[PDB]
Amino acid sequence: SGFRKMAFPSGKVEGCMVQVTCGTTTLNGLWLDDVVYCPRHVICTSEDMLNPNYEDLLIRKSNHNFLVQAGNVQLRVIGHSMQNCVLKLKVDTANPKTPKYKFVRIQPGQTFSVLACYNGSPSGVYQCAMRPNFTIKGSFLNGSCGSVGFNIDYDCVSFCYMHHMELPTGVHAGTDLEGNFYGPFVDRQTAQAAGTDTTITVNVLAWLYAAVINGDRWFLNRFTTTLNDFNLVAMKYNYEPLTQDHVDILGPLSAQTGIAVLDMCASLKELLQNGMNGRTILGSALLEDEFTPFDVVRQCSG
Amino acid sequence: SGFRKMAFPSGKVEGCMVQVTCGTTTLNGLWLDDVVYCPRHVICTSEDMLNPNYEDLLIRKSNHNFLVQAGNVQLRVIGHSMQNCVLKLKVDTANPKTPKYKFVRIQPGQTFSVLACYNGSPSGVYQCAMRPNFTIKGSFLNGSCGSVGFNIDYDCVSFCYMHHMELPTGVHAGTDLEGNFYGPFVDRQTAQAAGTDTTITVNVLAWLYAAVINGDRWFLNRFTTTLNDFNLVAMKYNYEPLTQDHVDILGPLSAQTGIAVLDMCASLKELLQNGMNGRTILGSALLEDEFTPFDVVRQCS
Ligand SMILES: *[C@](O)(C(=O)NC)[C@H](C[C@@H]1CCNC1=O)NC(=O)[C@H](CC1CC1)n1cccc(NC(=O)CCc2ccccc2)c1=O
Ligand SMILES: *[C@](O)(C(=O)NC)[C@H](C[C@@H]1CCNC1=O)NC(=O)[C@H](CC1CC1)n1cccc(NC(=O)CCc2ccccc2)c1=O
Ligand SMILES: [Cl-]
Ligand code: NA
């Protein structure tokens, strides 16, 4: 038993990480088949950052302006293509380490794993949620851009995130692997607002289920609640409202523990209104909202 | 910026993970060169588990009893050697994915990454600290035995831990790769005590430093304390006493932040003496002691 923030093993993705250099700027790219994917701002000087015209800036570049290094070997860039906020460099070699893979767009409240890289070398791996405001609380220094987030489904790597920038609050923003931002963000050096973050209620309920599986039972009451009653309490503590769909998702955990989703909602209800009375839950003094029901099932059952 | 529990990438160690079967028991092994290491209780049936004579139990086994599998491939076991609490199965083939590696015995206080496996398939990676009472707060289901813990220095993999068992309190216990148990534990199904854990003081300071680098400033104070003054309040709140070596190890974070180690020791005296009152440092309402000074550096420069 036990319970940690756990990430998918990084192997299949370590094999796709390369270094991309354009003049002064070097950052990380994703080499799959004969394409390398990286953020388009690789072309920007720090002058360009304030207010780039990526169209004009890319016309100034030719394939030979792009240095791609796979470990100790360079890959000749033959083509290049701007797709929204990513750059696709067509290269003369196909990644023989290319896994079975997918590009997906994750939803708020869903988690993925981040392979944090620098100069095309994997440095560290960790688990993130896409916040309801389409930001991530990651760990990125300069040189980490084009690091990716991913899930594995046995054989298949799902690529969902590429890291582009850090916002004034210290939270991070990136794109899907077709180069569209999550949220109202642009690849430019200007102060950008994220908006009010909210707690991922369905994930918090999942965490409380993980707590009971691991034998923290003190916060359980014999009470139940309706979805509407829970929700008008919840709104008040800035909690994402809970739909029938969120209940159907929590179902398998209901069943592993024999506690109905709505009895657990009554338990959450009481925690927001009473607040933990200096007790802990999975040795935490606050409620955790970055574990999906899938995360909890993956770990507390497989 | 930002600050996360980070694990080393698992690619190198994923290459070395195999499934080992003895009769009915199946678990994870580490395959380096032409040798697979695994926990020895692989030879046990669940009655044996209660009080095993590993010597007489191993005697009954021959190489053919030992099914080893690398994905779909069967490796021919051609020799077996019990070393403390690990089995060394010698096989006909060198792992061609064997990284540069060492076997190390980490100290209490130090972190490593865990690659959790089932049926010789990696499933997840997480970061642990070795507790002062030689337990780990792992995440381990049945099948995870033979899961290994490690650090990476550039290209070289330091193997430090192999998973054997869960204690009555929910924490986990294992061996180095010479199969000596971390702590006063044996591979018997019998209730065993870890006894009093303590807070790793040097880690709390490094984490306080991680906080300042990230702009959690609020707990900084005009004051500075002495080691002796600091340690008197440490003894009380069940913290490991602080030594010159600990100050010396915190030096580089001192350099990065411009905050003397004993200025920061005074923010901590403060916090233990007044609790946090439910205020948050890097959005934790409790003090974190599972980040080393090297882990904060590695991640904050
Ligand atoms: C990547 O491009 C990279 O890793 N290699 C170059 C970086 C990674 C960043 C920087 C540190 N942490 C990260 O996550 N990305 C950037 O530097 C972006 C590029 C922009 C999309 C075009 N970037 C550029 C300039 C400024 C910022 N952010 C900040 O300066 C902090 C927020 C802020 C606050 C006040 C006013 C403006 C901006 C940035 O992220
Ligand atoms: C491995 O043998 C394995 O993965 N094999 C398939 C497991 C790993 C376990 C599974 C659950 N969590 C883990 O860490 N290890 C064991 O099953 C050990 C083997 C014995 C050392 C030789 N093991 C066997 C029996 C019992 C336990 N522990 C418990 O039952 C919990 C603690 C407890 C409580 C009260 C009284 C006694 C023990 C065990 O870890
Ligand atoms: Cl906490
Ligand atoms: Na916490």
Numbering used by the authors:
A (entry chain AAA): 1 to 302
B (entry chain BBB): 1 to 301
Task: Show me the paper's own sentences about this structure.
The main protease Mpro is a clinically validated target to treat infections by the coronavirus SARS-CoV-2. Mpro cleaves the two polyproteins pp1a and pp1ab, which are translated from viral RNA, at 11 conserved sites and is essential for viral replication and multiplication. The active site of SARS-CoV-2 Mpro features a catalytic dyad comprising Cys145 and His41, with Cys145 being covalently bound to the N-benzyl-α-ketoamide in 13b. We established structure–activity relationships for the 13b series by modifying residues at the P1′, P3, and P4 sites.
Third, the cocrystal structures demonstrated few interactions of the S4 site with the Boc-group that capped the amino group of the pyridone. We therefore expected that this part of the molecule was amenable to larger structural variations and prepared the two subseries 12a–12h and 16a–16e. A benzyl residue as in 12c led to an increase in potency (IC50 = 80 nM) that could be further enhanced by a two-carbon spacer as in 12d (IC50 = 40 nM). In summary, the modifications of residues addressing the P1′ and P4 pockets led to up to 9.5-fold increase of potency compared to the starting point 13b, as demonstrated by an IC50 of 40 nM for the α-ketoamide 12d with a small N-Me group for P1′ and a 3-phenylpropanoyl unit for P4. Also, the best Mpro inhibitor 12d was merely equipotent to 13b with an EC50 of 4.1 μM in Vero E6 cells. While the larger P4 residues as in 12d enhance inhibitory activity, they are not beneficial for intracellular exposure. With half-lives around 2 h, 6c, 12d, and 12g exhibited reduced stability in mouse plasma; however, liabilities were not observed in human plasma. With respect to plasma protein binding, the acyl-modified analogues 12b–d and 12g had the lowest values in the range of 50–70%.
